[PDB]
Amino acid sequence: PEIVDTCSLASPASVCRTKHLHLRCSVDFTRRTLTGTAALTVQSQEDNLRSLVLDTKDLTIEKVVINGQEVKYALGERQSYKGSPMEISLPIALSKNQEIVIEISFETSPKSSALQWLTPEQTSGKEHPYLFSQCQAIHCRAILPCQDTPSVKLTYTAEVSVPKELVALMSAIRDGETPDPEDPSRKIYKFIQKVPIPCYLIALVVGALESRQIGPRTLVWSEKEQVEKSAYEFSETESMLKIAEDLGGPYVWGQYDLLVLPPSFPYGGMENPCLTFVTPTLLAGDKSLSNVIAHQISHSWTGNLVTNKTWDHFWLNEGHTVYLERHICGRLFGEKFRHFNALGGWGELQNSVKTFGETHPFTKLVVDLTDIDPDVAYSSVPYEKGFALLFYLEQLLGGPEIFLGFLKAYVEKFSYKSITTDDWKDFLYSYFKDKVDVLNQVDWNAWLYSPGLPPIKPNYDMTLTNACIALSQRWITAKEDDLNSFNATDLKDLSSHQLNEFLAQTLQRAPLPLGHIKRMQEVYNFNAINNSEIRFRWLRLCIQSKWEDAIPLALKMATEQGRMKFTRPLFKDLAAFDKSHDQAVRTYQEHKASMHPVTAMLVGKDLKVD
Numbered sequence: 289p290e291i292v293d294t295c296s297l298a299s300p301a302s303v304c305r306t307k308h309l310h311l312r313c314s315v316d317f318t319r320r321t322l323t324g325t326a327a328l329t330v331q332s333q334e335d336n337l338r339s340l341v342l343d344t345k346d347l348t349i350e351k352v353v354i355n356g357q358e359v360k361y362a363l364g365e366r367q368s369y370k371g372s373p374m375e376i377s378l379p380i381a382l383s384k385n386q387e388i389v390i391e392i393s394f395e396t397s398p399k400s401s402a403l404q405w406l407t408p409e410q411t412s413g414k415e416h417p418y419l420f421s422q423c424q425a426i427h428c429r430a431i432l433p434c435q436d437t438p439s440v441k442l443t444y445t446a447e448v449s450v451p452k453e454l455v456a457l458m459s460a461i462r463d464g465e466t467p468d469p470e471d472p473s474r475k476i477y478k479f480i481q482k483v484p485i486p487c488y489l490i491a492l493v494v495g496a497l498e499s500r501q502i503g504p505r506t507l508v509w510s511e512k513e514q515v516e517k518s519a520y521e522f523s524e525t526e527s528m529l530k531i532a533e534d535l536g537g538p539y540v541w542g543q544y545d546l547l548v549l550p551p552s553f554p555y556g557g558m559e560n561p562c563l564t565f566v567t568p569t570l571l572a573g574d575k576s577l578s579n580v581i582a583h584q585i586s587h588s589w590t591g592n593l594v595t596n597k598t599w600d601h602f603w604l605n606e607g608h609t610v611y612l613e614r615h616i617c618g619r620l621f622g623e624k625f626r627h628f629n630a631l632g633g634w635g636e637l638q639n640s641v642k643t644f645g646e647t648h649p650f651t652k653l654v655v656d657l658t659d660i661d662p663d664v665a666y667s668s669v670p671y672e673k674g675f676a677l678l679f680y681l682e683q684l685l686g687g688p689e690i691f692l693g694f695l696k697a698y699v700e701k702f703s704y705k706s707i708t709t710d711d712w713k714d715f716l717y718s719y720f721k722d723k724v725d726v727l728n729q730v731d732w733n734a735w736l737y738s739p740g741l742p743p744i745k746p747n748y749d750m751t752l753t754n755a756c757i758a759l760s761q762r763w764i765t766a767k768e769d770d771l772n773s774f775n776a777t778d779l780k781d782l783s784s785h786q787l788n789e790f791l792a793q794t795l796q797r798a799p800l801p802l803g804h805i806k807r808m809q810e811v812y813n814f815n816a817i818n819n820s821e822i823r824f825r826w827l828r829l830c831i832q833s834k835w836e837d838a839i840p841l842a843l844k845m846a847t848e849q850g851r852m853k854f855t856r857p858l859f860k861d862l863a864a865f866d867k868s869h870d871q872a873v874r875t876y877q878e879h880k881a882s883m884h885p886v887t888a889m890l891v892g893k894d895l896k897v898d
């Protein structure tokens with residue numbers, strides 16, 4: 289009764305399980321390689337085990353040692369994005385539950401899809417280079433040989449040699465630093481992760497980093513030039529940790545540090561344990577994008593403690609975490625705000641479903657990733673169809689206090705484990721046994737397995753949304769002789785969040801007439817806003833509405849940062865505008881070599897430029 293991880297080529301957890309990784313490596317900026325040894329402590333789950341298979345991607349293997357002697361191994365043919373399977377022949381057959389240590393000597397490729405190597409010119413300080421990883425979903429195999437499946441959890445320790453002017457950090461507790469005895473131009477940084485984790489949570493950064501304390505268990509890390517602004521921007525972090533602990537139970541990870549990466553970091557935030565990674569596009573100056581912090585914090589329960597068994601079940605990670613995120617922000621800013629953000633998320637789902645099409649398999653809640661790259665299937669669907677299901681169930685079963693009791697019991701039940709949608713569903717029924725007649729009203733096949741918008745829409749408070757819709761509708765319904773009526777005062781009682789939702793509402797009906805968009809800049813001066821979420825939607829509205837003056841502004845945002853949420857749609861919208869098409873493509877081609885490897889692939893696909 290085992291389950292299949294169709295994104296991994298390694299032996300499954302039913303055959304063998306990695307219990308620990310000891311990584312010893314050196315970061316070579318002249319070669320853009322990580323070189324070292326991965327010592328995997330492996331437990332047999334079978335009688336008479338005589339071989340096993342690991343995932344690899346663009347790794348060079350030097351040798352494999354067990355019991356102090358080299359052993360036979362073979363690398364199979366590459367399977368596209370999944371990489372190449374590595375079969376290791378064990379020297380003595382293992383009994384069930386026997387544990388051995390396998391030490392693999394390897395080197396990464398400069399093209400490693402897990403890594404971006406930055407030159408000094410690409411950093412803030414301009415003197416030193418920089419390295420960062422991103423393993424979720426299936427890029428840990430492009431760093432080191434492993435069972436690259438979230439169905440397996442392991443502890444780890446590491447020693448990382450770097451040029452002595454730089455700092456290494458990992459998703460782990462810091463365990464000291466020392467000069468490298470093999471090379472006095474280097475330092476060795478040590479790390480320990482004593483909580484078992486899925487390997488997609490392994491993370492590394494190397495650069496000219498400094499730290500500032502912002503709470504009792506939190507330092508923010510960045511280059512010098514960003515430290516002061518980051519400490520302010522993220523100053524709600526400890527209050528959010530305290531709320532999260534109330535909702536999910538104790539925080540088990542020791543430290544909660546934050547790392548603010550350079551602008552090409554591909555995501556808004558990644559929940560690497562003990563060291564969340566975030567985009568610098570969160571530095572709005574007013575703490576207004578802190579829901580991304582609340583999301584990563586929440587993963588310290590839903591995701592890092594309770595984990596999806598395979599990426600087909602990614603909605604478990606994300607839906608529950610958006611649910612908790614929105615509760616943290618509702619406790620800080622009020623229940624009307626929670627419903628505002630919830631309703632907005634439904635808008636996002638509407639957008640995503642229209643983009644893929646209402647029958648598309650990537651619009652199912654549980655996806656089948658057989659032969660699909662997870663990076664391509666990735667979308668807002670698991671987040672927002674997931675959230676919508678849990679919000680619907682909250683309403684069905686008695687409200688937020690009652691549903692939060694379920695969430696905490698779910699985290700407790702499945703801590704340190706990896707689970708499927710059916711495990712989740714079974715526990716829901718158990719917990720809610722005295723409401724099973726309500727539960728049986730749910731159309732489970734449609735919500736879990738059908739494409740498109742869900743079969744039923746929750747109920748949402750409208751208080752904070754109403755002014756956004758009203759203003760949007762005034763603009764959409766305006767004719768030329770109404771344009772004079774608009775004025776800066778129209779925005780005076782709108783928060784940044786409400787201005788963003790006004791633009792989202794308006795973008796859903798784009799294009800508008802060019803003269804309307806010019807009027808908007810004349811009276812609202814949106815070109816002056818630096819909030820990245822607001823600028824992104826404004827520039828999309830401008831390019832879809834065929835305003836040539838917006839072309840250079842959209843090109844610049846698309847290239848001067850690399851969060852894919854912003855760069856992919858800006859490039860797509862520029863390619864679709866005939867006036868900007870040729871330049872969009874020439875700009876992608878010019879920048880491709882120095883982009884994040886996954887962002888480069890996905891922008892190329894989006895533009896049909898191979």
Ligand SMILES: [Yb+3]
Pocket residue numbers: 767769770
């Ligand atoms: Yb009129």
Ligand SMILES: [Zn+2]
Pocket residue numbers: 583587605606609
């Ligand atoms: Zn997440």
